[PDB]
Structure formats: C-alpha cells, structure tokens
Swiss-Prot record:
Pfam family, one: Toxin_5
Function: This toxin binds to the surface of glioma cells, and inhibits their proliferation without having effects on normal brain cells. In this context, this toxin has been described as a chloride channel inhibitor (probably ClC-3/CLCN3) by causing its internalization via caveolae. It has also been described to selectively interact with MMP2 (in complex with MT1-MMP (MMP14) and TIMP2), to inhibit its enzymatic activity and to decrease its presence at the cell surface.
Family annotation (InterPro entries): Scorpion_toxin-like_sf, Scorpion_toxinS_Cl_inh
Protein name in UniProt: Chlorotoxin
Protein origin, superkingdom: Eukaryota
Length: 38
C-alpha cells in the first residue's frame, strides 16, 4: 500500500520510527494512520 508502516498516536516515538522506515531523519511523515515517505 502507500504506507511504509503505520503511525499510532499511542506510540509517542511514531515520528522517529517513521523516519527509520523511510531511510533516516526527516524522510517520513505520519499523516493520519500512515507513515508516508516524503
């Protein structure tokens, strides 16, 4: 699908994990329930 992985609001480190998914610092964004690589 579109997402690299999910983003869950209950996960306070969601933005860091999402970046990790997307290849490093500033590369992913949590947009609603999806981590999307920029």
């Amino acid at each position: 699908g579109s997402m690299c992985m999910p983003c869950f609001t209950t996960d306070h480190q969601m933005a860091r994990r999402c970046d990790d998914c997307c290849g490093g610092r500033g590369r992913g964004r949590c947009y609603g329930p999806q981590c999307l690589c920029r």
